[PDB]
Amino acid sequence: CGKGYHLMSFPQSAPHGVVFLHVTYVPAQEKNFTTAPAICHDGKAHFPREGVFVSNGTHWFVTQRNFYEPQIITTDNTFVSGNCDVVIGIVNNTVYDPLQPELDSF
Amino acid sequence: LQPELDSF
Amino acid sequence: AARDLICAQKFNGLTVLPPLLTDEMIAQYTSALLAGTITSGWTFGAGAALQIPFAMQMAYRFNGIGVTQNVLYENQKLIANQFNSAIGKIQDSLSSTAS
Ligand SMILES: *[C@@H]1O[C@H](CO)[C@@H](O[C@@H]2O[C@H](CO)[C@@H](O)[C@H](O)[C@H]2NC(C)=O)[C@H](O)[C@H]1NC(C)=O
Numbered sequence: 001c002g003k004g005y006h007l008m009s010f011p012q013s014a015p016h017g018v019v020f021l022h023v024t025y026v027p028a029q030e031k032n033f034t035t036a037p038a039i040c041h042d043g044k045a046h047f048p049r050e051g052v053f054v055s056n057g058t059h060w061f062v063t064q065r066n067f068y069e070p071q072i073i074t075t076d077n078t079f080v081s082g083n084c085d086v087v088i089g090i091v092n093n094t095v096y097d098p099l100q101p102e103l104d105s106f
Numbered sequence: 107l108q109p110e111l112d113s114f
Numbered sequence: 115a116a117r118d119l120i121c122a123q124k125f126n127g128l129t130v131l132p133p134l135l136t137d138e139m140i141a142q143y144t145s146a147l148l149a150g151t152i153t154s155g156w157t158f159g160a161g162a163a164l165q166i167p168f169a170m171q172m173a174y175r176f177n178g179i180g181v182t183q184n185v186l187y188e189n190q191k192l193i194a195n196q197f198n199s200a201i202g203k204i205q206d207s208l209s210s211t212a213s
C-alpha cells in the first residue's frame with residue numbers, strides 16, 4: 001500500500017483499471033546517537049516497551065524508533081523483566097521514579 | 107507501590 | 115569427446131539469452147540486503163538505512179510475535195549458538211543430504 005509507512009489510500013476511476021494515491025509516511029532527516037540494549041539501575045535491567053534508548057552524548061533518552069521525541073527515563077515506558085549482569089551490551093545510567101517528584105519530594 | 111512513601 | 119546437448123540446442127535456433135543481472139551483481143544485491151538487514155534492520159525498507167545493533171534488531175523482531183524482549187537479553191548466547199548450529203545443520207544438509 002505504498003513504499004514506506006502506509007497511512008491511507010484514494011481510489012480513482014481510470015480507463016480499464018484503477019489508480020491509488022497512497023499517502024505515505026517517509027522519514028527524511030537522520031541523526032546519529034549512542035545506544036544501549038538496557039539500563040542497569042540498582043541491579044535491574046530497564047529496557048523500553050516502545051522506545052529505544054539513545055543518548056546525544058551526555059543524557060540518555062527513550063524516544064521512539066520513527067520520530068525523535070526525546071523523553072526522560074521513567075518507569076512508565078520501561079519494564080525490568082530481568083537482571084543487568086547477564087546481557088552483553090549495557091550502560092550505567094539512572095531511571096527516575098514518577099512517584100518521587102510529585103509525592104516524595106513534594 | 108506504597109512502602110517508599112511511608113515505610114521508607 | 116562427443117557432441118554436446120547444448121550445442122545441438124544452439125545449432126537449431128534454440129538460443130539462450132543471458133540474464134541482465136549476472137551472478138556477481140546478484141550476489142552484490144544479496145550482500146547489500148544482508149548488510150542492511152544486519153546493520154539497519156527493517157528501517158531501510160522505508161527510505162534510507164537507519165543503523166541499529168543486531169541485538170536490538172533481534173529484540174525488536176521478538177516484539178513482533180507477542181514475545182517480550184527479555185527472552186534474548188537473558189539468553190543471547192543460547193539463541194546465537196542455536197542459530198550457528200542450525201546454519202551448520204543446513205550446511206551439512208547441503209554437503210551430504212541432497213533432498
Ligand atoms: C545533550 O542533551 C542534554 C539534555 O537535554 C543537553 O543538556 C541540556 O543543555 C541545555 C543547554 O545548556 C540546558 O539548558 C539544559 O538544562 C541541559 N539539560 C540538563 C538535563 O541539564 C545537552 O546540551 C545536549 N548536548 C548536545 C551536544 O547536544
Ligand SMILES: *[C@@H]1O[C@H](CO)[C@@H](O[C@@H]2O[C@H](CO)[C@@H](O)[C@H](O)[C@H]2NC(C)=O)[C@H](O)[C@H]1NC(C)=O
Binds near residue numbers: 192195196199
Ligand atoms: C531449551 O532448549 C535448548 C535446546 O533447544 C537447551 O539448550 C541445551 O541444553 C543442554 C542442557 O544439558 C545442553 O547440553 C545443550 O548444549 C544446549 N544446547 C545448545 C546450547 O545449543 C536449553 O537448555 C533449554 N532450556 C532449559 C531451561 O532447559
Ligand SMILES: *[C@@H]1O[C@H](CO)[C@@H](O)[C@H](O)[C@H]1NC(C)=O
Binds near residue numbers: 030
Ligand atoms: C554519525 O557519526 C558516524 C561516525 O563516523 C558517521 O559515520 C555517520 O555518518 C554520522 N551520521 C549518521 C546519520 O549516522
Ligand SMILES: *[C@@H]1O[C@H](CO)[C@@H](O)[C@H](O)[C@H]1NC(C)=O
Binds near residue numbers: 040091092
Ligand atoms: C555500573 O555501576 C555499578 C555500580 O554502580 C558497578 O558495579 C559496575 O561495574 C558499573 N559498570 C560499568 C560498565 O561501568
